[PDB]
Design a binder for this molecule. Structure first.
Ligand SMILES: COC(=O)[C@H](Cc1cccc(C(=N)N)c1)NC(=O)CNS(=O)(=O)c1ccc(C)cc1
Ligand SMILES: [Ca+2]
Length: 223
């Protein structure tokens, strides 16, 4: 997260770290057994880490639970990043408490202009590289279709939305991928892609979670 702030320990209790010997992506706990992340974060050997603040120190509120299976969206297109969503099932149920909690799926899509919370342990620099050990947070608005479409030379689909500031300085970044965008109290986005981080006229692109609720519910009903 570039241009954000230290969240405070366990203030974002649905935020998870995905660990394959090291932190590589974020995710969101949606119930005691399932995490939503980005399809581009797929890999084998995932351990889900719940209740984290400092990812490099055991502070006492963590739950480390291995993934049993990962399910990439059936239409995920790595060429275009269309349908950049993945479900991760836990080998055992998380113990839900004040510091480890689920975030609900949306009933309706969030509206342009809504302020959202984006969080993660990703790079904090627009130029260069600095990784924080504690969880970082950013509040930023959903952009119009017009601004989002015109914001990249690359292909933009109806399953993506933009959040941030066209003037630059505030954005998600490398290592934030897969993590949550919470708007109107529900999980509305997944950190998906961007051109660099926090650059002028180059906002973040996010998976539009409200388009996937049927697939998520059907999938978790049978796995
Ligand atoms: C990988 O390095 C980076 O610093 C950012 C990471 C990133 C990840 C998620 C969200 C954001 C964000 N700013 N909201 C940033 N990604 C890139 O900079 C990748 N862009 S890119 O322009 O380098 C690029 C473009 C197209 C292809 C096929 C591959 C790579
Ligand atoms: Ca820790």
């Amino acid at each position: 997260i570039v241009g954000g702030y230290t969240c405070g320990a366990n203030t974002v209790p649905y935020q998870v770290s995905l660990n394959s010997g090291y932190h590589f992506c974020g995710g969101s706990l949606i119930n005691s057994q399932w995490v939503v992340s980005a399809a581009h974060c797929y890999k084998s050997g995932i351990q889900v880490r719940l209740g984290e603040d400092n990812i490099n120190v055991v502070e006492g509120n963590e739950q480390f639970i291995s993934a049993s299976k990962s399910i990439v969206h059936p239409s995920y297109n790595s060429e275009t990043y269309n349908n950049d969503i993945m479900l991760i099932k836990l080998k055992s149920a998380a113990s839900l408490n004040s510091r480890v909690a689920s975030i609900s799926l949306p009933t309706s899509c969030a509206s342009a202009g809504t302020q959202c919370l984006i969080s993660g342990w990703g790079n904090t620099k627009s130029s260069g590289t600095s990784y924080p050990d504690v969880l970082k947070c950013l509040k930023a608005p959903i952009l119009s279709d017009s601004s989002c479409k015109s914001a990249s030379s690359f292909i933009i689909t109806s399953n993506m939305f933009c959040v941030g500031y066209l003037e630059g300085g505030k954005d998600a970044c490398q290592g934030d991928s897969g993590g949550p965008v919470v708007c109107s109290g529900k999980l509305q986005g997944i950190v998906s892609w961007g051109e660099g981080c926090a650059q002028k006229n180059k906002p973040g692109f996010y998976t539009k979670v409200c388009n996937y609720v049927s697939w998520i519910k059907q999938t978790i009903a049978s796995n």
